[PDB]
Structure formats: C-alpha cells, structure tokens
C-alpha cells in the first residue's frame, strides 16, 4: 500500500535498470491509468542507469499510443534508455530536478538498425538533427539539466513547483 | 494485483523466454477467458525472444482450439517462437506497436529437431500466407524485421501508433 | 489460475515429474472424485517425464479413482508423460496437433529392469501393443506425432478445434 | 490443498524423512486425534527412507495415538517409509498395484544399537522372526506389493476401493 | 499454521538445532502460555540434537523462571542441550516414548570450561546424580535408551500410550 | 602416455573434444613419418563426444597411408564406435566384455552431419544406409560378438594370436 | 616412487576406478608386458570399485597378457575392485588380514542388466561358484573378511608376513 | 608434442579463438619465418571462431609474413576460422572430407569490423561484397566442395595425391 | 626434503589419513624394506586421524614388512593415527613431551566389523583387557604421553635423544 | 627456490598460519640442518599469526628436542603460537626487530589441558609466573619487542648487527 497508493495519483515509477519485466510493469500501468482517464496527465518519475532497448523502446511505443498528456520527471538521473523517456513526455511537460544527470550515450546490422530507430526518436523529440544526435550519441559524458534542456530532452529544471 | 487486473481485461501476457511453466500459465488463462465468453475478444501481448519450441507450439496449439478472436500485440520485440505466435493470431487482428523488433529466424536427435523445424515451417506458411519455400528460405537468414516489413511478410495485418 | 482450473475438474502434469508434483496431483484427482465420483476429470499433460516411481503413483491413483479421464497432450508426452496419456479412459484420450509423444526412455540392475517390465506391462494394456512391439518401440530414441501415437494406440482422437 | 487433505485425515509422507517432516507429520497425527480419537486416520507413503530417529519418531507417534491409522503405499515405500508402512492398524494396511517396497537400509555401536530397534519393530508388525528380518534387511532389492503383503509388511492390494 | 494451533494447546516444539532464534522463539512461547494461565500445564516436545549452549542454557533459564509445571516429551532423540531441556521439565512430568534416543554428551578454553561445569551442575541437580558421575557420564560417546535416561534421573515416565 | 606414443600406440581416452582429437591427430601425423608403412595402434575406450572432433580424428585416420589396428577396451560408444568401425579392413579389434554403441546420446546442419555419419557407417560396416539409420536410432549397446556380425570390427580375441 | 613401484613390475589399482585410472593401470600392464611375457606382476588393489566398464577394461587387459598376475588386497577391495582381485593367477590371490572385500555392486534397463549378468559370468569363472550363488551373494551389502573370500573363492592366500 | 609439430612447419589453430591463441599463433608464425622465409607454413584449422579482433591479429600476420601458407580445414572452420582457412595463400588451401565451413557469424564498430570482413572474405574468394553479405546472413555450413566452388579453398582431398 | 627424508629411513605420516596417503606410506615402507629389511624405520606420526581401512591398510604393512619400525609422535596422533602408534616394534614406540593421544574414534554391520578390528588391535598392541579398550575408547579424551606409555601405545617419552 | 638457498645458511623460516604441512617442513628442515652440524646454531625466522596449537607443539618440542643453538628472530609479527617458537630459542638467542609485535593472547576439558601445557611452556622459558602468563594470556593486546624482552620473550631488540 505504498506504489499502488502513488498509481492512485496517476504516477508512474520507471526505477533502476529497464528490463523486460520493468517494462511490462509500467506498460501495464499505463494502460490502467489510461482506462481510468484518457484525459488526466499521468506523470512518469525516471530514476534509472538505462538498460534492455526493446524493453525501452516498448514503454516508448506505449506511452505514444495512450492518449493521455504524459508528464516526465527527472530525479536522480535519466541515462540512455531512460533520457530517451524522459525525451518522450507530452511537448512542454518534461521536467528535471536541480541535481539530476542526464545521458543520450548508450548481428552487426541489427545493433545498428536499432541505433537508427534510437536518432530518429530523440530527434523527433529534441528537434536536434541526426546529424548532431548521432555524435552526441558518441560522447560518454552526463549533460546538466540546463544542458538537457537547451537540447530538447526536456522544457522545465524546476528548483519548487 | 496488476497482472490479475490484466487477466480481467481480457489481456495475456507472453513475456520473456518462454518455457513450459510461462506455456501452461498462458494457456490456463486462455480457457479462463473463453469460459467467460467464447466470443469476446483475447488480447495477448507478445515482448519475447521466443524460447522452447514445444512449450511455444504449446501455446500455439491451444490459440488454435479456443473459439475466441484473438489479437496479437507485439511491443517490445517479438523473436523466433514469439513471432510464431505474434503471426498466429486471427487473421486480421495481428498488430505491432512502431519499434517492435521480429525475427522468424530460429538462433534431443538429429531427427527430432528438424521434425520440430519442420512443423514451424507449416505453421509460419498457414499464418503468413506466403509459401513454404519463401519460409523455408527466409528462416536461414539472421536478422530481424520492422512492423512494417513484417506487415509485407504477413505475420502481421496492422501497424499501430495509436489506436484508430 | 491452477485452484481455479481444479474448480473446473482439470488436474495439470506439467514439467519434470517427482515425488513433489505426484503428490499434488494424486491429492487433486482425490479432491474431485469426492466432489463427483461420475463426472469427468480432465489431466493436462505437458510433460518431458521424469521420476519413474512417481509416475507409477499417479499411474495407480488414476486407476483407483472411479472417475472418467480424459488426458490431453499439448506440448509433449515423453517417457512417463505418455504412459500418463495413455493411462486416461478409452476413447477420451486426446492430443493437440503439434505435441509431440515419446514412449521411450532416457537402484540395482534388477530393480531398473523389474521396473522396465512393469512400464511394458502398462503400455502393453493401454496401447495393445504386444509386449515385443512395445519393448522394441521403447528402445528406438524418436518421438511420434500425434497421429502415430493414435495408430501405435497411445491415444484416441487428435483435435486441431473441438467437436461441438 | 494439503489443508484440505487434513481436514480429511490424510496425512502425507512424502519425499525424505528429516525431523522437519517428522516433526510435522507429528503435529498433524495430534491435530487428528484431538478432532477425534476414534475415526480412522489416513498415511500416504511415498517416500524413499531418511534419518532414522526421525522415522522412529512418527512410528511412536503412531502407536502413541488411540486412532486406527491407514497406511497407503504408492509410488514407494523404502527404508524408514516400509517400517512406517507395516506400522499401520492391522487390516489397514494397503498398497497399489504398482508400488516398490524396501525394508534395506555417529558411533558404531548406535548405529548398531538403532538397527536392533528397527529389526524388533519390523518383527513385531510383520510377525517375522529376528532372523529372517535380519537376513531380508541385509538384501538390496525391492519387493512387489504382494511379495510384502506375504511378508507381512502390508495386508491389502488394491486396484480399486472395497 | 500448524504451530500456532499447537500453541493454542499449550504445547511447544523444540525441533532440530537449538540456536538463538529457535530459543528466542521458544522463549516468546512460553511466556505467552504463563499469561494465558500462570497453573496449567506446559508441554514442550523435544526432538533435537542439540545446538548453541547459551541458546539452550536461555531456555533453560525462563522454563526455570516461568511458574508453569512443563511437561517435557522426547520423541526421536534429545541430545546434548536437548537433553537438558528434557531433564529440566517439572519433576514426574518428564517423558518419553519408547524408541527415542537420548544423550548427554556434548560432540576461549577457561570459558568452555566454564559452561561445561554450570551444565554439570544443572544435570546434578535434576537428574540427583553427584558431579562426579556426571562428568564421567558426559565423557563418554553414546546415546542411553529411554529406560536407562529413566535411571539415570533425566526423566521420569516411559510411554508406549496414554 | 608418451611412452605409449614410441610404441605406436596413439589413445582416443574419455569424451572426445577438440583437444583430444588435435592431440590424436598430431600424434597420428607422427607416426606416419616415423613409418608410414608401420602399423598404429588406436585405443579406444570412450563414451563418444564432439560430432566434428571425432570426424576431424576420423579424416586424419583416412588421410594418413599407415595401417591403423584399432581396439576397443572398455566401451566405444558413439563416435567412439565410428573411430574403431574406420581401422584398416582386417585390423579392427575389440575385447571380450567390451560394449559398443553406434546410437548417439541449426536443424539442417544436425541432419547434414548425422547423414555424414550414415554414409562412414555404411562405407565401414558394409550396411546399407537404411540398416545404418535404424540401427542408430536403438538405444542398446552391442557385444563384440554383435558388433563383428555387424561390421564395426573384425575379431574378438581372448589373448594375442 | 611410484616409478620406481612400476620398475619392480608392481601396478596400484587406487582409489574409484574411471577411465583415467584404468588407462593408466592398463598402459602400465602392457609396459611389464613388454619387460617380461614371463615375470609375474603384483596388482595392489586397494578400491571401493567404480566404473563398471573400466573395471571390465582393466579386467580384460589382465587377462589379454600372458604374465602371471599376483593380486594384492590391502586396505579394501569393494564391487570392481574385488572382481580385479578375483581376476588375478590361480593361487596367487592375496589379501593381509585386515582388509575388507565387497563383491555387492552398490544407460538403459537392459544394459544395466547386460553388464550385470557380465559380472556373474567372470565372478562365476574365477570363484568356481554357481551363477545362482554369484546372484544371491552380490545381493547382500556386506562385506567378507579375507577368511571369507578364500572361502569363497575370490582369493588364495591370507598371510600376515611373507612365508 | 605441439613444440615438435613447429620443426615440421606446422601451426595448429585450435578451439575458440581469442587473444592468447592469437598471440601463441602469431608467434609460431614469426619463428618459422626467421627459421625460413622461403619455406611453406602448414595451417592447421579446427576452430568454431572466436574474438573477431583475434581473428583479424592472425589474419594480418599471415599476409605480413613472407611465407607460402597453405591452410588445412580439419574438423570445422566456422566463423574467424573460414576467414583464415580462405587467407592462405592460393592453389595451397585445403580442407579434408567431412569438415564443415562456415563464414556466417553467430553499434557503430561491429559494423566496421563487419565491412571489414566483406572486404577480407571478397579479396579471398573472388566473390561479390554483396554476395558475402548475404551469404554470411544465412545461419548455415557448407561442405568443402561448396566451400571451394564459393572461393573459400582449393583442394577437397581424401589422400595426399 | 622429502626424497632426502626418505633416504634417511624416514616415513611421515601427516594429516588426514586417505588412501592417497596410505599408498604413498605403503610404497615408502616396501621401497625402504628393499634396501634393508633389518635396519630400522622411522614412522613420524602428526595425524587427526582418518580412513579406518587406510589406516588398516598402513596398519597391515607394517606388519607385512621385516624391519623394525620406530613410531614417533610429534604434534598428535588421534583416531587412527594412534592405532598406528601403537603398532611400532616394541620398545621402540616414542612420543616428545607435549603430543596429544586419542584412541578414541557403510551398513550398521560392517562399521560394526570395522571397530571390533580395531578394539582387537589395540588390545594386541597396548596388552590391556578388551572391556579396557572398548571402555576407554568411548571416551572422548587425549591422553598425554605418560598416560599413553602407562596405557601400553608407546614405550618412551623424551624430550632429547 | 630462495628458500633452498636459505636452508644451506641454516635459516628455517615459521612464516603466515602455522598448520600440519607448515610444521612438518619446519621440522624436516630442522632434523636435516642438526644432520649437518649438530652443534652450529640454527636461525629460526618467525613472521606468522600463530595457528594451530598441536603443529606448534610439534615445532616447540623437535626445537627442544634436536642439540642445536636456536636464535629465534621476530620480524613483522609472532602472534600466538608464533609467540610461543620465538620465546623458545636458546637463551640469550632471542631476537626482534624494532616494529615487530609480540603477542601471546590466543571438548572443554581437553582444550583446557592443552591452554596449560601453553601455560607451563611459557613460564619455563619467560621466567614468569604460571599465575602471570594465564592472567595475561587473557589480555588481547600486543607487545611492542622492549615489552616482550621485559615480559621473558626474547632477549634482543636489534636494528642492526
Ligand atoms: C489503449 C488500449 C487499447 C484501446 C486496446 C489495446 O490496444 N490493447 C492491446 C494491448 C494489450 C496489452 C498491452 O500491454 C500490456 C498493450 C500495450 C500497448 C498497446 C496495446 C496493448 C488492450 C487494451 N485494453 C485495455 O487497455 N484495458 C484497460 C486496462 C488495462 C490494464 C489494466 Br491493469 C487495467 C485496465 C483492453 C481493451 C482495449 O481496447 N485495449
Ligand atoms: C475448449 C475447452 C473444452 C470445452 C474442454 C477441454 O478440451 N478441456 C481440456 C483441457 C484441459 C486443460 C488444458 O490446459 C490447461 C487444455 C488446453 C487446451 C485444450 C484443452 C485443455 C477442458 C475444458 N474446460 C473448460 O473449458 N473449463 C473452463 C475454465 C478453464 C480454466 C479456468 Br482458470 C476457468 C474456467 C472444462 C470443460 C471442457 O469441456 N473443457
Ligand atoms: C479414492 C479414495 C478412497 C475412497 C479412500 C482412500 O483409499 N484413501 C487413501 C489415500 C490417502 C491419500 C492418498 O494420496 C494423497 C491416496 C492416493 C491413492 C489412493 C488412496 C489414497 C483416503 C480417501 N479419502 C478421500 O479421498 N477424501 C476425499 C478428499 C481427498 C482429498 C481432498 Br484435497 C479432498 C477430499 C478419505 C475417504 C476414503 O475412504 N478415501
Ligand atoms: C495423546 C496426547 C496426550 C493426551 C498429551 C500429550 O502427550 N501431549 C504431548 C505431546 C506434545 C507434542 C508432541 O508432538 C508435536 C507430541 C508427540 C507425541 C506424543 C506426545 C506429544 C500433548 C497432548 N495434547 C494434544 O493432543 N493436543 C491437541 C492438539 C494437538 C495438535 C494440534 Br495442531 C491441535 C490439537 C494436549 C492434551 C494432552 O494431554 N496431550
Ligand atoms: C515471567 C515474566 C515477568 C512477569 C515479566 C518479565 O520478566 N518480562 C521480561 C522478559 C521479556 C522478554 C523475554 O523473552 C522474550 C523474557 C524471557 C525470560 C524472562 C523475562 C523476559 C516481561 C514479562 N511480560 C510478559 O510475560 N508478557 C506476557 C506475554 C509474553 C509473550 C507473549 Br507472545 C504474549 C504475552 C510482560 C509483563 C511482565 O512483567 N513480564
Ligand atoms: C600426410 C601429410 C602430408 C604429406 C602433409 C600434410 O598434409 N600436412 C598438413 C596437416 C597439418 C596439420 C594437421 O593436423 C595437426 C593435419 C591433419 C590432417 C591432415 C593434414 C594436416 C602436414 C604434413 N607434415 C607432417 O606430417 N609432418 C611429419 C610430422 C608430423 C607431426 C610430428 Br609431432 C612430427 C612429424 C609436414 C609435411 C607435409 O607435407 N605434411
Ligand atoms: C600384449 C600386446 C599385444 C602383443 C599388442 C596389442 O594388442 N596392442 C594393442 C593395444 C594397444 C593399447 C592398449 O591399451 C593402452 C591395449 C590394451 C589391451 C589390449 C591391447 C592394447 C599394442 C601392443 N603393444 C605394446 O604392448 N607395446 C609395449 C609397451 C606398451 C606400453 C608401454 Br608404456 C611401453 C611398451 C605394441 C605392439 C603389440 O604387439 N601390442
Ligand atoms: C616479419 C617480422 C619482421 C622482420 C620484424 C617485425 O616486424 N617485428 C615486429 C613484430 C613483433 C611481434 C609480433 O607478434 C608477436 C609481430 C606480429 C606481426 C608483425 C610484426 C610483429 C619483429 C620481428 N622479429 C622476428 O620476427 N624475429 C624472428 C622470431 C620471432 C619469434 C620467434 Br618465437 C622466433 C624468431 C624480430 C626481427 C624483426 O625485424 N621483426
Ligand atoms: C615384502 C614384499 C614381498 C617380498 C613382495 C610382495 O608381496 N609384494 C606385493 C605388494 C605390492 C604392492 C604393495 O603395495 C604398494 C604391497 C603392500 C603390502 C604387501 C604387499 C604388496 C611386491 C614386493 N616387491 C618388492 O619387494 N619391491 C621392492 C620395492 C617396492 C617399492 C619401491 Br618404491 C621400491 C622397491 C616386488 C617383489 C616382491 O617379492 N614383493
Ligand atoms: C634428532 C634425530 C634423532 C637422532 C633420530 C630420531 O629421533 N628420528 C625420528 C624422527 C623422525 C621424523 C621426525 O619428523 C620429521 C622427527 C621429529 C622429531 C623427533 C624425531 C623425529 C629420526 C632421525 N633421523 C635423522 O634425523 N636423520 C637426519 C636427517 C633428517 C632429515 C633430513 Br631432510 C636429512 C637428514 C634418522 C637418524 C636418527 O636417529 N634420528
């Protein structure tokens, strides 16, 4: 009675490393809060190293297919997988914590296929070319949330509400 | 419990490698929801690698002998005994999300396995509709599929971004 | 699921067979013929076999029971699995058309051997097979089809829908 | 399920005998008892054996208790689950078709001494003689239902109920 | 489940290796069943190879402190701290079955030392037997039948029925 | 063991693997420059192992000129039984108590290899490939007895003639 | 050391018999084969058994020399191992006075069974029992003191020191 | 046994391949041309593949050395292991009877080093970069004489001739 | 150091006794009779004990071999160990000041068997009565070397030669 | 191995946990250095925790019991039964370097009868008290090398000869 009673208020919890089975979870939960409102926001709080990117790419699809305004909420930090989550709220409900870090950098043909899916997500989102994503991509380093934000992973760095 | 909430939704969920216990788990729930109603409509989710073959064409048997219309979701990815399944939903209501990954390819005797291989063969020709040779040959390449090439292929009749 | 399944008179043998699953099984055919002593019980079989003692427990309490048995492969019926197949009452001894059904086989010499006997002795019955065509059966290394196991006698009907 | 089984008075020896079994399968012969000390109570064995202290500890419960108790052997009765079988109420005790039973089996005189109360125990239920137990006991073989039931290890085979 | 029902007859299970949590447990028991009735009778059953010293030495301590007469039962074996537990039931209320194995013998160095003569003294005291005879007694490696603990004072009854 | 190996005496001991069968044929391409007219002796006591190892032993064995005297001490099963069926005609040998096994404990490639089999069985044994895959299929040892009516070996000697 | 042991034509069958250790004893037959058709060669046999088809191994390969084969138990000889002591030269099977010998024995239903009734045939042979009383005494989990097993026939001499 | 297979010429490529095969391969290599850069190197193969960079170390040495390299397919040559068993130098590869040959391979760098591989494998073979790309796609083996009409070696034998 | 041992006439029994160890003990005790079977053995005895048939089987050889042997216990010799003690050439059985002696210590029968050999060897050895022996070797207890030279398992303490 | 060499200076090195195998060689190397020269002192370095009680014993008394000089030399630490070796070399032979720390903190019946042999071993060669070296063998303290020569432990303090 503690991550039922925070579904109650339409928040969902994408935490640690994304898997298959962390997947499932918050696909099943949007789909729950969906039948509840397809209107109300639902608000996405991200605290996660990354992880499993067809598990990643699922809970993306899924929060593309509700209706529901997603509002996504940076704490701790959003690498990889998790920053392209972050990228994926509703336009101008993406939001950062002051401390939070954020990181875009993550068969031979497949890999790559599935890099290109990964520029074409954060670009329709971010409105960086693939060009830049692609080098972006490349450098391992954790962007502030002022960064983040002049990049297009996200619209608000809120210190209150 | 969410997964319950799922079952009463009409929803089942083939997740993860599949084996005897996820099979006989799924195939429960599925004469649960025709006890139900033999007419309304089964959903069943499909994020999985694939796994054993006899516990997928456990699956896949019981799919066929329920009454009910039952539409596939691929989300995530679904390979080898996933999309086996994935293309053996009823006709028409096969579905994947945008950035789904397929593969058909497939990564006891000698004899036994290619029996084994050789029913896949049947059941990927039935349901995509294509010819045995076209799968037969298919099957030996080491790649995954789009939504939309496996659209092309016929495991799937829609690709869906949101709900139409 | 599987408490809500034995409300529905269908009993689950699915995976390895031990001491374990034996038990729960015999206690669940028990349960349901005290509810009903005439109405049919219905066992799942997916099983590669296992425990040959254990199979042997169930084996007797499905023939002490009073009750009709109708068997079901989906999946496989190997080793023990089969002998529980064929084990269900004449003519309500089903299979799904992609399971796959082995009678052969994977303490002193004596005791193994006395033990073999016993399972051609039960086969022999259930399948009417001679007891030569049975030993030499359960020697080939190979699992049949459904439709091969119908012919050899291991089971009666092979459903790809149900009847009515 | 196993609650049910219980409220039925079936109690279940299942799988190697430890203290942990033993200890439960006592506690439930109690349970039986207080609800009533008369009705029959039913033992299923499958079992292949285990500590013996732990073994002769659920045949004194048995003898303990004022109930008639059924034994069941199914799938197998070795070692410790053969003694706790021939432990039953004379008249009820009971094979299937198709069970194994096997009456083969610290300081070396407790074992010895351990093994002494075993061959009394099986001379007693059996009505056997010290020798012939002693000589059997020494056998790595299993018998037959009605090799056992001639034994005097158990009284009926069943196929079916009465 | 089944423990807990126990429990509600005012029955308590010592089983398997005595450690800190078993005594713990044990102790939790005991004080539960001396507040329901502070007169009536306590049955501990005993079926134990004995374990930690000061975890049997804790349920020593509060079978001592609690005021309740404690009917102590051995069924399969009580050994070495198990023993004393046994041998430490109220006077005419310890028991045994008739095939359960009982031992006395124990399996810094000035503190081992020390434990062992403050469990010489505990069985002098309930067994009557001199010091003496029990250090010479704990010596030697072997488990004594129910009739001969009978004897030697650690219990008082051997029961083949109620 | 290298002692062995001065007397023309080469060991296909327990599972065989790719190191075992690179040792083997080394030890084969050894003899055959020592003489390539003396006989090998091959000691077989193996429960069988890896299908292309024991092919790999199997070609080294047909490609070197030398008469190869095989022995089956022990067991020969599985591939085991392949290496004594491919001693030189005349030459294949085994032990009174010995027990031989023909059976075996991508799809298409398992095929491939396994018709390989059939094809070196029927050529030694002088079996038609129907009786060889029947055969194989039969979980059961042969006596040595069995196995020379068979075709697997040649004599089954109590003591050296 | 136990280089030196082979150079005085003396092989230890130690310890559970596997593939390995019937190679090596079977290798190491062979080398005294060559030294010597004639020689004897002194088998230590101090074994609980194991392997049944290496026990055969080892068994054939005893046979398959000429040399006379002076079996020693010491320590125990127990399943294979008794069958190897049994396997040595007429009249020149031993055992010192505390071992202990085991002929109880402790793949498919027939197999087991084939090799089995293998076993009765070279017990039979080297004991000069009946196959009949081969079965019923490998029945029994006992083992036989060295009395016992001269009596039998598994062994010639029971000595204490050299005569 | 292996140290006196050197003085033959020989160098065996055995088991996975990763950086201390590599690196003992690689030696062996250097040591027989110092010994005689005229000299053939005979190029034993019993491999399943391994570590592509490993793979890519021999590959380079090979060509590096002055040497005639005639490669030797005994058992099976799968993955890294065709592309070196095809590296020797041509009319001088081998493979014997009942081997198998296999150059499929079971983000941005597995694509390189599989660029590289078309264009190591096409140099070798003759064949197309597209038709090793699709070849190499396709999870199957070939036997020897379809691996000679594919470019991959030269010589099926059964005896030397 | 312990070939040079050894060529002293110096046997070492140390640790756990396995039929590894007893085998090596064996073959030292035949190889040492060989050079001489009238000069003496040193036995050193540093053993918790072990194996009862291994310990039987050095117990045996002992006895078997000619020479006089000199049993020395330095550290322990418990269980076994002691049996082994004991069995030195009469007065020739040592023990230095501060070693610690125990003589305390399959189907129910058979270890049955086993300790009344061992209750008959003590009593052999030692010259005390068997309910001496089967009483004491119920107790568990060390004696030190006086207690064990008056018990009858050794002959002489020393604390210097 | 450098401590071969070591042997021939007539140095034994007590290093790390004292045990069976540990004590053994320390001993061998004892009766082979007397063997040498009975009456040319031995050097015993000792840089060990202690360990087993009876394998120290083992050590106490063959030093006892072989003629030689013994000049103990503490350097790291003699813990323990460590302790107990370093007090029991020649008089006037027992040294420390300046950092080492000495200490000599460590059935029920049976362990107690040892903790007095310890006991009396340590009043003989400290000259202290049995009174004193009980109450401080309970003391869980080290001593620094001026502490443990006051206390009877070793003669020398020495930075350099
Ligand atoms: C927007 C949802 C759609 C309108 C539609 C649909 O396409 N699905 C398929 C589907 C199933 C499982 C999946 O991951 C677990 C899916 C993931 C992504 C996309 C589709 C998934 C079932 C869903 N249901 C549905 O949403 N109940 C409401 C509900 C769901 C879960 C829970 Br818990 C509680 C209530 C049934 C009726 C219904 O109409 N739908
Ligand atoms: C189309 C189903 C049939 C109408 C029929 C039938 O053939 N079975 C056999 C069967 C058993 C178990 C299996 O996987 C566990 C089976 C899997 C595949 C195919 C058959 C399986 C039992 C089923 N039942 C039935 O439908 N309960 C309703 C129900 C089931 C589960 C749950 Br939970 C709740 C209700 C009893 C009456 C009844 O007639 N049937
Ligand atoms: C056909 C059953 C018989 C009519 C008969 C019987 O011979 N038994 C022995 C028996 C016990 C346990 C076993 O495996 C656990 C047995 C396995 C195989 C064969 C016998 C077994 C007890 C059973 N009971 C009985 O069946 N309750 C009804 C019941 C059982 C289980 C559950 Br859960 C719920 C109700 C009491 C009355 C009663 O008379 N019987
Ligand atoms: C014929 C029983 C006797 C009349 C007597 C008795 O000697 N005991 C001791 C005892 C305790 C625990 C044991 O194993 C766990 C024992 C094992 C074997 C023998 C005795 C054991 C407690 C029992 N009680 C009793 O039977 N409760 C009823 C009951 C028991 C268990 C459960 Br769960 C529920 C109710 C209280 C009244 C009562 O007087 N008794
Ligand atoms: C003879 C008990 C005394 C009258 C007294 C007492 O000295 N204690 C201390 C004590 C606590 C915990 C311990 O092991 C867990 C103790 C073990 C041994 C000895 C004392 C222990 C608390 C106890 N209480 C008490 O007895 N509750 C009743 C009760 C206890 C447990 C449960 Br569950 C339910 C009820 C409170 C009132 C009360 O006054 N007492
Ligand atoms: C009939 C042999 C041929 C005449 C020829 C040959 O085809 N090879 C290739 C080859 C190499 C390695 C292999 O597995 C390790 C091979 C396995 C199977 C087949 C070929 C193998 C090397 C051999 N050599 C050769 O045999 N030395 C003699 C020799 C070998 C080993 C040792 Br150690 C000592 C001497 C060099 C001269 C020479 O020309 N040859
Ligand atoms: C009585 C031996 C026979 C006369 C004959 C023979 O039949 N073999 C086959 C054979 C090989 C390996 C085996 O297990 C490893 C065998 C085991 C059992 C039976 C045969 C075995 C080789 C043996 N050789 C032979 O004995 N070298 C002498 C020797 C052996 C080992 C060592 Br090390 C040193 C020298 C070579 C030529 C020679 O004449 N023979
Ligand atoms: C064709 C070799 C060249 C002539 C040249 C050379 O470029 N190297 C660099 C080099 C080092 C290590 C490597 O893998 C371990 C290399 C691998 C690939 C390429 C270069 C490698 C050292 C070599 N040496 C040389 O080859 N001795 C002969 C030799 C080597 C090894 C052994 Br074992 C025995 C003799 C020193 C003299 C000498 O000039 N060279
Ligand atoms: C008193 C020894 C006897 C004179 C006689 C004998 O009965 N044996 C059998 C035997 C073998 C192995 C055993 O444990 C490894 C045995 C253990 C206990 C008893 C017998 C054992 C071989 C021994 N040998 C012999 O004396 N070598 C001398 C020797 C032994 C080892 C080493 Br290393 C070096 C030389 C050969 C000739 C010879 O005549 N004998
Ligand atoms: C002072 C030694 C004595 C003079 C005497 C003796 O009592 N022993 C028994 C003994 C053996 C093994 C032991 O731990 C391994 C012992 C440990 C402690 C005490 C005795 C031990 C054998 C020794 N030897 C002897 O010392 N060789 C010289 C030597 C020893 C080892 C090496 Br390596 C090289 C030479 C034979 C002649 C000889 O007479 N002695």
Chains 1, 10 share one sequence.
Request: neutral net charge; hydrophobic residues 40%; charged residues 20%.
């Amino acid at each position: 009675d503690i991550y039922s009673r925070l579904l109650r208020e339409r928040i969902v919890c994408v935490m640690g490393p994304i898997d298959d089975s962390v997947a499932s979870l918050v696909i099943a939960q949007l789909l729950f809060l969906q039948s509840e409102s397809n209107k109300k926001p639902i608000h996405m709080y991200i605290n996660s190293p990354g992880g499993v990117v067809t598990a990643g790419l699922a809970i993306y699809d899924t929060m593309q297919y509700i209706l529901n305004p997603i509002c996504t909420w940076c704490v701790g930090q959003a690498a990889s997988m998790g920053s392209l989550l972050l990228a994926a709220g509703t336009p101008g409900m993406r939001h950062s914590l002051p401390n939070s870090r954020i990181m875009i950098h993550q068969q031979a043909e497949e890999i790559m296929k599935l890099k290109k899916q990964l520029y074409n997500i954060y670009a329709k989102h971010t409105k960086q070319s693939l060009q830049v994503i692609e080098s972006a991509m490349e450098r391992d380093r954790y962007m502030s949330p002022m960064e983040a934000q002049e990049f297009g992973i996200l619209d608000k760095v809120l210190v209150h509400p």
